[model samples]
Target: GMSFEITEEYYVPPEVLFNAFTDAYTLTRLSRGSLAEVDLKVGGKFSLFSGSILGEFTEITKPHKIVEKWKFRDWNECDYSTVTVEFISVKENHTKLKLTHNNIPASNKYNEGGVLERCKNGWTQNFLHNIEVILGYPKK
Candidate 1:
């Protein structure tokens, strides 16, 4: 398996951005219209992106870090990835959020369709776009 990361700078405090990721209503808006589901405790499960992204919470640190067992519906049922999200306050009203997705199945384990590239696109295009623009969170 391989790992990849995504980083974004949001012109908002870590507390605000963290709520967007863990609060169901906030997440729903950040997902751009889906009925997002989020549970903010260890072992809590979340169904996001209209269920395309499914995961269970493994770790949570208020306003700073979250770790989850993430998986996509396109992948094999048994395949799961570890995603760690860290929110760093770079300045007043700004946060640098880093997302590291690990344990991705190597090419041989999955079909050849640029799995890593697709994952990156989902974060930048779908997630970030919704958060930074659609949901009105400023970008840095």
Candidate 2:
């Protein structure tokens, strides 16, 4: 098992950034054509990246913190990860988004190795970077 954390700053308020992650419309825009389903409540289910990622909301603090029982589609049926995303207000219209992913399997049949690295890169490139572009704040 393994864990990793990624912290990124966004030029948006915590509520906005939180909605970007939780709202299906915003998520679909951020991920391009990937369909998203979100039920923003404790024990609610969500599927993102066109169902490649699935999860159940374990905790929610609306615009502040979200914890989930998460897993990739390729992971073993019995294996699940814990994902915690925290939105911190650094300043007016500025947010520090932190993602902590834990209990990831080091190796699996679908992914031989470098699972953590791939996830880290995916979060930045696939999600955060796109969010930046969609929100009209391309990295400078």
Candidate 3:
């Protein structure tokens, strides 16, 4: 098994950045998907990318951290991994998102093109870009 970490900085504060991940409409837009489901409470569920990504919230500390059992439909239903996201207040209007994916299988197709790289691209290019646009931030 392997693990990967990603840190993303946003111009918005922790509250705003956290809300983007919890709000259904905002998240759907972030994923550039037609529909999304989000529930912020512990044990709640979230589905994004038209359900290609599905997860159940394992733990949540409002405006600080979120942990989920994340899975891709391409993998076995029971073959999910843990994803932890921490929000750090970097400046008055800036936030640093520390995200880590743990227990990723080494031999699966998820690692074919390098799971870490793939996830980095997806988060940065796809989701992050959309998120910036939705929040009125300048896209990179």
Candidate 4:
């Protein structure tokens, strides 16, 4: 299995950054992505239409952190992976996001457990773009 972590810092608050990830509908709006379903409760469902994951939310903390159980199953049904997002505070108007997609299949070359570049681009790069867009406007 392969795993990786990406940390992003935003010049915005945690609440705003948090909402863009947790709010089922708003998530897609700001994230520029689609979520097929999101129950937002412990052990509840959460998946993206353009994604291959069909998993449950292992943990959720409003405006702070979220953890999910994610697995492709095609590669390894016996093993379950986890994704964790943490919104840390830097000051009155700054937030630091520490993201991790762990326990994935990792070969010597790349994280074959899933889409290697997609995983990096989605969580590490694109999501930060969404944060900047949302930050341009006031928190709703």
Candidate 5:
């Protein structure tokens, strides 16, 4: 098993940042056209990047936290990772986002090598950075 964590500050309010991650419309836009389906409830399912990423929500505390059983479609069918994201409001229009991804397969052919490192970069570069751009938040 392997794990990674990332913490970043966003120029948006906690509620806004939370919705950007959980709402289907914002997710699709942030992913740059990957169709997203988010059920937004405990035990509900979500598919992002046209199902390239699949998960079921295990916990959802609106405008604050989300936890899911998540995995890449190409990963072993029996393997799923736990992803927990927390949003903490630092100011009226600023929030800190924390993501902890755990229980990832130590080795995955689909990721070539260093899946943890790639995932760490992916969250910031692929998702959070895009969220800032698309949502008109200033880059920091």
Candidate 6:
């Protein structure tokens, strides 16, 4: 059992950044090249081509948090992970949003955790690195 976390402290307000996660238009920026057919709803389907994390929304606390059950489609062991997103408003113009990925099994290689460093290696490069680009850098 293993996990990885992605945290981003944005200079923008919570409302602004929060909207990006739910708003298809803004969120599409991050999803343009990699993410696909993502519908932000309790049961809306999300497709990421060869990799897809699909599940119903467990909870969505507006203006603050959103949690969902996530697992890659082609994974051999389906980790059945939970993605918890917390938006923390710290200033009049700043918000710190942290994402925690829990209940992931590193033994499974379907999602890139089979040998060597396990989950730590893959999550750092794939997940957290995406957050860096999502916050400021452009993936395109």
- The lDDT per prediction is 0.84, 0.83, 0.76, 0.69, 0.85, 0.61
Q: Each model's RMSD to truth, in Å?
A: 2.0, 1.8, 2.6, 4.3, 1.8, 4.4
- Give the CA lDDT, 0 to 100, for residue 82 in model 3: 85
lDDT of candidate 4?
0.69
Question: Candidate 1, overall lDDT?
Answer: 0.84
Candidate 6 at 99: error in angstroms?
0.9
**lDDT, residue 126, model 5:** 84
Ranking of all candidate structures by their TM-score, best first: 5, 2, 1, 3, 4, 6
Q: Report the C-alpha lDDT of model 3 over 1-140, residue by residue, as the tens digit.
A: 26878777877778877787788988877766569898778899999878888899988888998889987666655677788889898878888888888876543345353555655677767777776776775321
lDDT of 6 by residue, 1-140 (tens): 45567666766677766676665455445554555455677766554433554555677678899887766664445457676878898777677878787776554554455432443454456544654566563321
What's the C-alpha lDDT at position 32 in model 1?
A: 71
TM-scores of the models, in the order given: 0.89, 0.90, 0.84, 0.75, 0.91, 0.69
State candidate 3's TM-score. 0.84
Local error of candidate 3 at residue 38 (angstroms): 1.4
Instruction: Show the lowest summed lDDT stretch of 10 residues, model 4.
Output: 107-116
The candidate, 1 or 3, that scores higher on lDDT is 1
Candidate 4 wrongly placed segments (more than 4 Å): 30-35, 72-79, 107-114, 134-140
Badly placed stretches (over 4 Å) of model 3 are: 107-116, 138-140
Question: Would you give me the overall lDDT of model 3?
Answer: 0.76
Backbone clash tally for model 4?
6
Tens digit of per-residue lDDT, candidate 5, span 1-140: 39878888877788888888799999999989889999988999999988988999999899899999998887788888899999998888888889899998875646566767767777888887887777787634
Number of clashing residue pairs in every model? 0, 0, 0, 6, 0, 0
TM-score of 6: 0.69
